[PDB]
Amino acid sequence: GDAICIFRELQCLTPRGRYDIRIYPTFLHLHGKTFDYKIPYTTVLRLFLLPHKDQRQMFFVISLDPPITRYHFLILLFSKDEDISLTLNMNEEEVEKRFEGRLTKNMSGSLYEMVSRVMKALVNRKITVPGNFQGHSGAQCITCSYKASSGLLYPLERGFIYVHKPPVHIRFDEISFVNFARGSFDFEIETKQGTQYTFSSIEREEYGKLFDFVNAKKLNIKN
C-alpha cells in the first residue's frame, strides 16, 4: 500500500499501550487499539536513544511539536534482544534517492535500532545518545523522582533528559545554574527564564559523579 513499512505492536510509554507504526513518505500513523494519530515528520524536533539502567531495554524518544492530556514526546520501549528484518515497499533506486543512502530495501538488525534508523532517515535528524556520563552503579542514567513519580535522568552531551512520566528535556544552554539540595539528595536546575526542575530522591552515592559531570560541562553551581 502507501506505507514504506509498518512496525507492528511497538511498546509505547507516552501514550501507554502497544501501537503499530505505519511509515508513510511525509508522516507516520501511530495506530492503537482505540486511538489514532498522524504525525508529520516536520513536527519531530529531536530523537534520542537511551539505555535503560536495567541493561536489558532501550528507550527511543521522539520529541514532538505540536504535542500529540498532551504528549510532547512519543517514547517507545524495546528489549535489546529483539531482532527484526524489514523489506521496504519501495524499489532500491527510489530508496537511495529518497534517503541519501541511509536506507536499503532489505535491512535487518535490532528492533530498536531499525525503528530509529528509519525515523532518522525520514525526519532527517541525528540520534542523540549518551556521552561519557557514568553514575555510581556504572549506568548512564540516575534513578530519581520528578513530579512525584519515579524515572531515570540522563546527563547527555548538551542537555538532560528525564523519562518517562512525564518526560522532560533541558538543554545546557537553557540552564542558568544548578543546585544540590538536602533530601538522598535533590538535584535542582534553574533555567534562564526563571523556572525550576527538581529531580529528587537521588541516592547519596550518586552525588560526586553528577557534581563532577556538571563541573566538566561548565554549568554554574549556585549551592
Swiss-Prot record:
Note: Autoantibodies against SSRP1 are present in sera from patients with systemic lupus erythematosus, but not other rheumatic diseases.
Name listed for the protein in its UniProt record: FACT complex subunit SSRP1
Oligomeric form and interacting partners: Interacts with MYOG (via C-terminal region). Component of the FACT complex, a stable heterodimer of SSRP1 and SUPT16H. Also a component of a CK2-SPT16-SSRP1 complex which forms following UV irradiation, composed of SSRP1, SUPT16H, CSNK2A1, CSNK2A2 and CSNK2B. Binds to histone H3-H4 tetramers, but not to intact nucleosomes. Identified in a centromere complex containing histones H2A, H2B and H4, and at least CENPA, CENPB, CENPC, CENPT, CENPN, HJURP, SUPT16H, SSRP1 and RSF1. Interacts with isoform gamma of TP63. Interacts with FYTTD1/UIF. Interacts with SRF. Interacts with NEK9.
Record's subcellular location: Nucleus; Nucleus, Nucleolus; Chromosome
Signal peptide coordinates: none
Cross-link (Glycyl lysine isopeptide (Lys-Gly) (interchain with G-Cter in SUMO2)): K97, K165
Function statement: Component of the FACT complex, a general chromatin factor that acts to reorganize nucleosomes. The FACT complex is involved in multiple processes that require DNA as a template such as mRNA elongation, DNA replication and DNA repair. During transcription elongation the FACT complex acts as a histone chaperone that both destabilizes and restores nucleosomal structure.
Organism: Homo sapiens
Residue list for modification N6-acetyllysine: K38, K209
